Amino acid sequence: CIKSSYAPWPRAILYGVLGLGALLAVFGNLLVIIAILHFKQLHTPTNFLVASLACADFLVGVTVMPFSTVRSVESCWYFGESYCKFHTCFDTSFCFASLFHLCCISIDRYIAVTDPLTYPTKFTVSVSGLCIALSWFFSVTYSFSIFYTGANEEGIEELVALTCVGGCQAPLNQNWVLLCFLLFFLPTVVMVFLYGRIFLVAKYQARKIEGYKERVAKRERKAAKTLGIAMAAFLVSWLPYIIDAVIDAYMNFITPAYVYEILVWCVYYNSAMNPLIYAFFYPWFRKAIKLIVSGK
Numbered sequence: 481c482i483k484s485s486y487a488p489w490p491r492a493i494l495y496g497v498l499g500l501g502a503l504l505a506v507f508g509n510l511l512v513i514i515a516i517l518h519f520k521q522l523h524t525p526t527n528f529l530v531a532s533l534a535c536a537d538f539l540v541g542v543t544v545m546p547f548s549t550v551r552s553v554e555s556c557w558y559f560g561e562s563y564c565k566f567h568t569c570f571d572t573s574f575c576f577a578s579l580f581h582l583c584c585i586s587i588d589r590y591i592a593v594t595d596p597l598t599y600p601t602k603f604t605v606s607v608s609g610l611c612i613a614l615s616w617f618f619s620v621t622y623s624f625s626i627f628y629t630g631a632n633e634e635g636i637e638e639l640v641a642l643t644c645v646g647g648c649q650a651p652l653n654q655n656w657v658l659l660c661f662l663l664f665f666l667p668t669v670v671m672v673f674l675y676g677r678i679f680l681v682a683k684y685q686a687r688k689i690e691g692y693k694e695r696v697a698k699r700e701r702k703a704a705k706t707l708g709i710a711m712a713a714f715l716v717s718w719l720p721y722i723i724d725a726v727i728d729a730y731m732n733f734i735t736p737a738y739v740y741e742i743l744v745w746c747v748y749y750n751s752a753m754n755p756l757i758y759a760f761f762y763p764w765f766r767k768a769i770k771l772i773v774s775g776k
Contacts, residue, residue, distance in 0.1 A: 488740065498549045500747065505541030509534050511757045515768040521770070526588055526609045530758060532738035533581040534614045535551060536574050537659040537751045539670035542747065546569045547729050548748060552741035557646045561622040564648035572650070575747060578754065582714065583667040585758070592675040622663070622707035632656050649740075657677055657729035665723045671714075675707050706761075713757055717750035750769075 488494075516522050517530040551557050557564070566730050588614060592599050605745050626632055633642065641647030652660060686699035721743050759765045 481641075481642055481647070482488070483556060483644050483647060488553070492553070494553050494709070495549070495610065496684065496699075498552070501749050502541055502545040502549065502747075504756070505537060505545065505752040508760070509538040509541060509755045510763070511753050511769055511772060513538065513708070514772060515759075518772070519768055522558060522764070525603060525605045526592070528605065529581060529585055529588065529611060532576055533585070533758070534755055536577045536581065536616075537754055538580075540571060540574045540748065540751050542565075542572070545748065545751075548741075548745070555737065556743070557648055565667065568648060568650055569623050569628050571748070572627050573619035575619075575751075576622065577615050577619035578719070578751070579664070579667055580588045580618055582610075582754075583671055584611040584615065586671040586674050590678055593678050621695060626656055626659070636733065641737070649737075651733070652729055654729050657725060661726050664718065669719075679703060679707055685735055712755055713753050714750065717746055720746045 512534045513531060516527050516534075523654050544567060547559060547563075548560075548571075548726075588603060591603055595602065632650070634653060636651055636653050637643050639649065639651050642651060644647055657731065682703035683700060686696055686703060689699070690696055724735065724740070760769065
């Protein structure tokens with residue numbers, strides 16, 4: 481439809497800031513899916529969740545990432561109008577599957593920390609399997625039934641570029657934006673509450689071990705930084721988008737297209753940081769990754 485190219489200034493550093501995320505989310509994730517399969521020591525029921533999250537994130541990195549990069553910098557979608565129906569249905573499922581995987585990971589961590597004695601019996605491969613079969617089903621029966629059937633555009637077509645050629649977007653309407661808001665919100669309160677309880681337990685154990693403020697301070701800092709890193713990496717990536725989505729539906733669609741693409745990448749990018757935080761932050765994973773890179 482000859483839509484305005486909307487080309488940016490020659491400061492095209494964006495390619496070297498957007499493509500690196502795809503390279504990370506592909507290579508560092510494929511290197512994690514191998515360390516859980518080759519080695520026979522990492523076959524624990526709590527590592528299957530991490531492997532499933534890694535696969536769901538590698539799917540994003542290998543399918544949606546590059547096309548999203550091209551669409552965001554060039555603002556013109558040169559890949560055919562056929563894909564627009566499938567591309568918008570891939571990330572909508574994969575990101576929510578990753579969010580629910582994070583929810584079960586937090587639940588698992590809370591169960592392990594709060595209840596250490598009867599941990600093996602209460603959390604087996606089945607529960608790990610059950611967690612995986614629910615999140616995926618959840619990310620598939622929402623994305624397909626809300627986005628593929630085109631039931632999210634029942635009234636709003638005033639965003640001149642859904643009514644064009646070569647334009648693809650996800651303009652949630654008034655009714656279904658509340659459903660999306662709840663989806664993102666439900667698995668966040670539980671995770672925050674569980675991490676708060678874990679931090680309180682860690683502080684109590686640090687208090688018990690010593691006995692001196694100068695000594696408890698280091699333990700508190702150590703126990704708080706690990707949780708805060710994950711909390712920030714999740715919130716500052718997911719929050720920006722949901723806020724924008726909730727504000728244009730009830731609001732009369734005021735949002736320049738040159739920022740919406742930037743905002744979406746904020747949710748996407750959480751993909752490049754998820755494996756580097758949940759896998760590489762530990763000694764064991766860091767040894768296996770080192771061995772895989774080497775000849776052996």
